Design an enzyme around this catalytic site. Structure first.
Site, PDB file in Angstrom:
ATOM      1  N   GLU A  97     -57.032 -42.515 -25.406  1.00 56.12           N
ATOM      2  CA  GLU A  97     -58.255 -42.236 -24.660  1.00 56.12           C
ATOM      3  C   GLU A  97     -58.020 -41.034 -23.751  1.00 56.12           C
ATOM      4  OE1 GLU A  97     -61.060 -43.943 -21.109  1.00 56.12           O
ATOM      5  OE2 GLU A  97     -59.833 -45.493 -22.090  1.00 56.12           O
ATOM      6  N   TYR A  98     -59.012 -40.146 -23.685  1.00 54.38           N
ATOM      7  CA  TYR A  98     -58.926 -38.974 -22.844  1.00 54.38           C
ATOM      8  C   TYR A  98     -59.446 -39.324 -21.454  1.00 54.38           C
ATOM      9  CZ  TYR A  98     -60.193 -34.436 -20.809  1.00 54.38           C
ATOM     10  OH  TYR A  98     -60.335 -33.360 -19.965  1.00 54.38           O
ATOM     11  N   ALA A  99     -58.615 -39.082 -20.428  1.00 55.94           N
ATOM     12  CA  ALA A  99     -58.992 -39.308 -19.035  1.00 55.94           C
ATOM     13  C   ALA A  99     -59.494 -37.958 -18.520  1.00 55.94           C
ATOM     14  CB  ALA A  99     -57.802 -39.784 -18.236  1.00 55.94           C
ATOM     15  N   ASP A 122     -42.799 -49.110 -15.883  1.00 54.43           N
ATOM     16  CA  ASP A 122     -42.773 -47.679 -15.546  1.00 54.43           C
ATOM     17  C   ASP A 122     -44.015 -47.173 -14.777  1.00 54.43           C
ATOM     18  OD1 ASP A 122     -41.349 -45.201 -15.488  1.00 54.43           O
ATOM     19  OD2 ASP A 122     -42.194 -44.542 -17.418  1.00 54.43           O
ATOM     20  N   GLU A 161     -47.328 -39.871 -12.465  1.00 48.12           N
ATOM     21  CA  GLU A 161     -47.395 -39.117 -13.722  1.00 48.12           C
ATOM     22  C   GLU A 161     -47.812 -39.986 -14.916  1.00 48.12           C
ATOM     23  OE1 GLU A 161     -44.456 -39.436 -11.249  1.00 48.12           O
ATOM     24  OE2 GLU A 161     -43.905 -37.435 -11.992  1.00 48.12           O
ATOM     25  N   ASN A 162     -47.710 -41.316 -14.784  1.00 49.56           N
ATOM     26  CA  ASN A 162     -48.098 -42.266 -15.828  1.00 49.56           C
ATOM     27  C   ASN A 162     -49.461 -42.892 -15.527  1.00 49.56           C
ATOM     28  OD1 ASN A 162     -45.669 -41.818 -17.270  1.00 49.56           O
ATOM     29  ND2 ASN A 162     -44.717 -43.698 -16.529  1.00 49.56           N
ATOM     30  N   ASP A 184     -49.289 -44.168 -19.869  1.00 50.51           N
ATOM     31  CA  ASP A 184     -48.024 -44.381 -20.576  1.00 50.51           C
ATOM     32  C   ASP A 184     -47.622 -45.825 -20.586  1.00 50.51           C
ATOM     33  OD1 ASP A 184     -46.787 -41.269 -20.480  1.00 50.51           O
ATOM     34  OD2 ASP A 184     -45.597 -42.672 -21.686  1.00 50.51           O
ATOM     35  N   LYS A 206     -50.819 -37.651 -28.740  1.00 52.52           N
ATOM     36  CA  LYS A 206     -49.419 -37.656 -28.341  1.00 52.52           C
ATOM     37  C   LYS A 206     -48.641 -37.423 -29.651  1.00 52.52           C
ATOM     38  CE  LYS A 206     -46.340 -40.515 -25.476  1.00 52.52           C
ATOM     39  NZ  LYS A 206     -46.334 -41.823 -24.776  1.00 52.52           N
TER      40      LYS A 206
END
Ligand SMILES: N#Cc1cccc(Cn2cc(NC(=O)c3n[nH]c4cc(-c5cn[nH]c5)ccc34)cn2)c1
Length: 251
Positions: free
Chosen positions: A84-86, A129, A133-134, A147, A35
């Site tokens: 971390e990559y999902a 939040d 999208e999060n 997020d 990010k």
């Protein structure tokens, strides 16, 4: 804790926008997500304190349904977050392909989220939040909270009447969010969705929602229980995890 720099990672495909890029740590061949936040952007918005909060909170959170924040680093103009990559992408992308989820898939995501939120609330950490999208999907299709930018004002959807009205709020905001998320998962759109920000405010404020014919009695009940104006009337996460509709359709 390891010291990092931009020259340690091979950057790739942008995964999302707020941006987050696919990255490979040159030495270990480790696949992660970077990010990239501009210092000049954070300055002109006064959200530097809000980023520090996110960094401090997510780095000490350890749960299989919470995305890991491995570390951070900054240069002359940018701030970097080693996340971390999902592998299976966002829940938002998934919902766009499928249009809506079945009761089985919905109840499983709800369980996975409620568990992760309970771990968060036990550490007195409120998400605030929660939205598709999060939310991300791991290697086994398990839901993961990505997020954490608003942990302890664009689209009003997912925000309870307390937060939108500027009043003080509990962990119960995440219970309302859970209710909005359950409806969106089954219907295909959030329960307070409108054309204007002003109309979405009214829809939320006076709690206006109607279930389409296909939404089952069991699903209707849990959504009704979670979408209460009074936060004290909202059920605890343990009540949700043990709800009949949840247990009957959950993996
Ligand atoms: N084209 C295409 C396509 C189609 C299907 C699947 C995938 C695989 N995929 C994997 C991701 N992963 C991520 O996006 C991701 N992986 N880890 C992330 C962390 C954050 C994040 C931002 N702030 N906090 C966390 C945001 C995003 C991510 C997305 N698609 C790509």
């Amino acid at each position: 804790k390891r010291q990092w720099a931009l020259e340690d990672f091979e950057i790739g495909r942008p995964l999302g926008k707020g941006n987050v890029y696919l990255a490979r740590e040159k030495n270990s061949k480790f696949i992660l997500a970077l990010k990239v936040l501009f210092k000049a952007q954070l300055e002109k918005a006064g959200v530097e304190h809000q980023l520090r909060r996110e960094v401090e909170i997510q780095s000490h959170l350890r749960h299989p349904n919470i995305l890991r924040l491995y570390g951070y680093f900054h240069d002359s103009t940018r701030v970097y977050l080693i996340l971390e990559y999902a592998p299976l992408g966002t829940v938002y992308r998934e919902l766009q392909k499928l249009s809506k989820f079945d009761e089985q898939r919905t109840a499983t995501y709800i369980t996975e989220l409620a568990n992760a939120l309970s771990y968060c609330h036990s550490k007195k950490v409120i998400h605030r939040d929660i939205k598709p999208e999060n939310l991300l999907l791991g290697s086994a299709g398990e839901l993961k909270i990505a997020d954490f930018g608003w942990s302890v004002c664009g689209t009003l959807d997912y925000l309870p009447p307390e937060m939108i009205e500027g009043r003080m709020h509990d962990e119960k905001v995440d219970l309302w969010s859970l209710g909005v998320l359950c409806y969106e998962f089954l219907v295909g759109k959030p329960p307070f969705e409108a054309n204007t920000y002003q109309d979405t405010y009214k829809r939320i404020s006076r709690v206006e929602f109607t279930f389409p014919d296909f939404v089952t009695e069991g699903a209707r009940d849990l959504i009704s229980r979670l979408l209460k104006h009074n936060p004290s009337q909202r059920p605890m996460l343990r009540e949700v995890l043990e709800h009949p509709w949840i247990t009957a359709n959950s993996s």
